[PDB]
């Protein structure tokens, strides 16, 4: 099966699941490769082909740092690239339904990996199940991520940053450009992406850029009011100038800084990028999203206090445990392996580990209000893991869905409440960040993949209200007596529950935890 | 003038006032002498006497420490009794306009002295002016302070607690049965008060007991739910028990206590008042009201939140600069003779003074909250002062005043801003605690005595403001094109300003240092 596109013809190749056929288009380039005099730049325009290109693999993923905490364990190496890293990595999926679609609706996947990290190509984003049970397209990208795809020296086009912002919107051109000739509506095109994927697809819906470049977005555990999602001019020019010393590469012409660093080896670029703050947590994104007077007009929060963002559709959610995934990567007497009971001495230098410079009365505040006791020996392992997901993911979307909805437009709030049969992660660490992925992305509706009956319906349910969302802008599962998701409005907050026993409306997500993150602790 | 009573006839004087003619009865008993075996009991009935009672001067004033704080400077002895300490004290005073009123408006005042001191006999609380001026009765009594008022075993009738609140509802009777003799209206009584005074009016509200010995309430610089103005249990056991010990009083059965304190000479109590808190601040108050199951039915914060109360309007009000009058009483760096600039690290001790029992995390809170400065040398001074006034007297009035509208009432809340030209005390200390008073008894209109002309046309309006809502239940001034004062309900928390070049209407005075003091504080 070939399809001929703007730039050339692409083969893809057929694939059977649920006893039909899916059509994949894996591996499509749609930008020059970043390469020498690109390195750093905003990506470029690619060039026609004639030949047929085979589009039967996935690409190279970006260059990346790996998470090496826990090697041979499935939890964390599932994460991991599974295809060979290269700066030759700007390239994108196609899955399509077969027969071949008249004008179905697209969703187009962002990958989180807090900016620093991730691929297109891992098996949870794994786009198939989508294109059969639902008949949408579904495309995903490879985008730059680290100093390689957000190092910035505001206003030098040289290294101008959120260049893999850049790359993700030049990814929604060619589906604009592209995709009716595979049988998709750019009509029809909604984002998804989780955590920093889900901060990203945030910063679209405020990129004037990407305003004509699609219909609606779902955000999962991300959005850019999150701590972690936008680096300062400040912090962003300390860091550039941290890694030019550490290369060797301190100069005075700062061209001649950018110059100096793309004759450095990418593994030597890779190397330096842990070190260019003094004090990291487990959650540091050394090198993200800046205002760069491009891509980002203003300071995001501005934009959203003032209702400066696309007017559309948002669906919107979160896990129980975003938090607890981040403790065994830094925070004291926490570990995979045992229940991790920690002292309050522990739980105060684990408030040291993710808030750094954060002053003294800063952090005995969050203490006392994750401290006062409803004791119980897991108290205070709860409570870390509490802060941690309530400030850097619970809080902020909750705060992005009321700012955004209190401009006219329909939002749909989720709590995601479901921990996986097949967790390789232990118990305590309940339901945690990124887990949800695959409930989304149909996993569960594979019979021979080892989920439960009750995960298989969870799935079911799931895909189609996302679906729905995507092509009707309304998350309703209508044919099942399903509890119907009401509009999260400012005033009574109402969210759904997502969980394999009864699924609830609920009010106010969170209220008093957020009360102090939102209003308080930015004060400190 | 000779006015039958119910319990014997009792002879005025008259009086010369502007032109005009004042009747006042001053020192008529009220209760049996709370003397002997009736020390520390709820007062008695009076019973008959024959001949003339002669109310020519004032009484005795009740037992009470004095401020021996500044000797010859009048800010502050103007505040100490005038007449001799006597636990003979419980009588009262009452003005009437010449010629005598055939249905007049009661205005009934209770002083305060944080519960430990007062009398009604203060030139700055004479009823004459009133009376004259606007037609009204003006009554006022004495009631008993400190221990010999407030000493409190729950459920003692020897020592029930609360005497002193009992010495008030005996005199609030005492004017439903016989005002109508001097021409009054006992279907017509307003009870106003200032600071432990206006709190004893804001606990009448809630005592069913005074129900039915008055119609609306004025409350200036104070309310039940300041931190000051109610005794935890807890507290005054051991207040008691204290007070016992210091006098070798200590016993077993509670009842032999009591008897013994009835034996110590009154001189004795006062000396050991001051010690039965082992740490008190210049806003201590040792024995005050307390929940004694009988004119407090339960903890009074439940109450107002539940709305059991007088259902009635009510009209409170603070002054700009409440905290001041209390820094020269025990905080470092400050005196009335110098400009008080303190430093950080005087402001620091200073909390301590004012916040002795509170964790170092609740100080440093405060600190947090009142010196993010918009540098100036009185940032410090000024803090404190606010700090003091805010956490004391402005966030308790606003909530007490929000709490109660919500339930149906009209209530009307003002901010008296005017300094007086002749305050004794310096300029840093601005517009102190105590000191609307002499306005809203119309000192002012008084052309001999030094005040300015501005002053004497501030004095007239309030006056006139309070008259017609103690009459009619709305403080307005209809005639002289006065700014119009809006009803404050609990959305919009409209308030008149008092002062002498433009009064306005403003909203939601201190709206950020009180969501600290009465949403955050009371977690510490
Ligand atoms: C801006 O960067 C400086 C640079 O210091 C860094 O040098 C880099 C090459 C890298 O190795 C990095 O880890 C190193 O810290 C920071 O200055 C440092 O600040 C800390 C304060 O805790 C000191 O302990 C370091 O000694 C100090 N180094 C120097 C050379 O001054 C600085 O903290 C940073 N500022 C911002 C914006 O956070
Ligand atoms: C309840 O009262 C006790 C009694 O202690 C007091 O004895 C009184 C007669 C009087 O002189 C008073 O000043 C004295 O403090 C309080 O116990 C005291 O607590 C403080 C703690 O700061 C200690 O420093 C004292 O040594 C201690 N004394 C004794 C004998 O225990 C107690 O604080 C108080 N509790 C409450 C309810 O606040
Ligand atoms: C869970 O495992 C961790 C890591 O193995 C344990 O934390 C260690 O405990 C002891 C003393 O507390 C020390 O030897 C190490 O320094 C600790 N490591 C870290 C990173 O904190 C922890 O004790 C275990 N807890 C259990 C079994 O509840
Ligand atoms: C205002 O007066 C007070 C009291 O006289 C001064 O505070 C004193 O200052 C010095 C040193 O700071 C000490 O000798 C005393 O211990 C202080 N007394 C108290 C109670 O704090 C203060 O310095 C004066 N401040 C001025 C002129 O600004
Ligand atoms: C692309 O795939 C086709 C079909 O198998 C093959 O014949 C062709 O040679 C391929 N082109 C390459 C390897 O570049
Ligand atoms: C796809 O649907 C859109 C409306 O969203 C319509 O305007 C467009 O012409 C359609 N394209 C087809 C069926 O080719
Ligand atoms: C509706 O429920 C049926 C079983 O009665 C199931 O086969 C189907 O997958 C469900 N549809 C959705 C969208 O959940
Ligand atoms: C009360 O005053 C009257 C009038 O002057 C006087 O004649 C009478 O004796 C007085 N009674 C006393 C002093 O008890
Ligand atoms: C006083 O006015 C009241 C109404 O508040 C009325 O009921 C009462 O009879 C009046 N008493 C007089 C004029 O004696
Ligand atoms: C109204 O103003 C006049 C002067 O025109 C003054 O004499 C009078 O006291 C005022 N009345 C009140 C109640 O303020
Ligand atoms: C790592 C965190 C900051 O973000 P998401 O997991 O992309
Ligand atoms: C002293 C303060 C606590 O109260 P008022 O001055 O009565
Ligand atoms: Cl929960
Ligand atoms: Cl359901
Ligand atoms: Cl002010
Ligand atoms: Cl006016």
Redesign the interface.
Same mark, same amino acid.
């Given at each position: 099966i070939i399809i001929a596109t703007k730039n050339g013809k692409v083969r893809g190749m057929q694939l059977t699941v649920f006893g039909g056929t899916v059509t994949a288009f894996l591996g499509i380039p749609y930008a020059q490769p970043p390469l020498g005099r690109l390195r750093f730049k905003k990506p470029q325009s690619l060039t026609k082909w004639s030949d047929i290109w085979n589009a039967t693999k996935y690409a190279n993923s970006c260059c990346q740092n790996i998470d090496q905490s826990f090697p041979g364990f499935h939890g964390s190496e599932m994460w991991n690239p599974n295809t060979d890293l290269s700066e030759d990595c700007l390239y994108l999926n196609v899955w399509i339904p077969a027969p071949k679609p008249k004008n179905a609706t697209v969703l187009i996947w962002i990958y989180g990996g807090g900016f620093q990290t991730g691929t297109s190509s891992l098996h949870v984003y794994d786009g198939k199940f989508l294109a059969r049970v639902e008949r949408v397209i579904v495309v995903s990208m490879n985008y730059r991520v680290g100093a390689l795809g957000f190092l910035a020296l505001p206003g030098n086009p040289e290294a101008p940053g959120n260049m893999g912002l850049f790359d993700q919107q030049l990814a929604l051109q060619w589906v604009q450009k592209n995709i009716a000739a595979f049988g998709g509506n750019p009509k029809s095109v909604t984002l998804f992406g989780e955590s920093a994927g889900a901060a990203s697809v945030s910063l679209h819906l405020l990129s004037p850029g990407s305003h004509s470049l699609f219909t609606r977005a779902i955000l999962q555990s991300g959005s850019f009011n999150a701590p972690w999602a936008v680096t300062s001019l400040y912090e962003a020019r300390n860091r550039t100038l941290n890694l030019a010393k550490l290369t060797g590469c301190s100069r005075e012409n700062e061209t001649e800084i950018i110059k100096c660093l793309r004759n450095k080896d990418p593994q030597e670029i890779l190397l330096n990028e842990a070190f260019v703050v003094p004090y990291g947590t487990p959650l540091s994104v050394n090198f993200g999203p800046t205002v760069d007077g491009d891509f980002l007009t203003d300071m995001p929060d501005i934009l959203l206090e003032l209702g400066q963002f696309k007017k559309t559709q948002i669906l919107v959610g979160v896990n129980k445990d975003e938090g607890t995934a981040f403790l065994v990567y830094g925070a004291p007497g926490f570990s995979k392996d045992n229940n991790s009971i920690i002292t309050r001495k522990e739980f105060q230098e684990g408030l040291k580990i993710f808030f750094p410079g954060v002053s003294e #009365?800063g952090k005995?505040?969050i203490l #006392?209000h994750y401290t006062?006791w409803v004791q119980r020996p897991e108290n205070y392992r709860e409570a870390l893991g509490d802060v941690v997901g309530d400030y850097n993911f619970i809080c902020p979307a909750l705060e992005f869905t009321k700012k955004f909805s209190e401009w006219g437009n329909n939002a749909f709030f989720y709590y995601f409440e479901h921990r996986s049969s097949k967790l390789p992660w232990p118990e305590w660490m309940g339901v945690m960040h990124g887990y949800e992925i695959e409930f989304v992305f149909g996993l569960p509706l594979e019979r021979r993949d080892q989920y439960t009956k009750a995960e298989e319906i969870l799935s079911r349910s799931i895909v189609k209200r996302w679906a729905n969302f995507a092509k009707y802008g309304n998350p309703q599962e209508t044919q099942n007596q399903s509890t119907s998701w009401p509009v999260f409005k400012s005033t009574e907050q109402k969210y759904l529950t997502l969980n394999t026993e009864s699924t609830r409306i609920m009010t106010k997500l969170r209220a008093q935890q957020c009360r102090f993150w939102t209003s #308080?602790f930015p004060?400190?």
């Open positions: #009365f005995e505040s #006392f006062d #308080f004060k400190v």
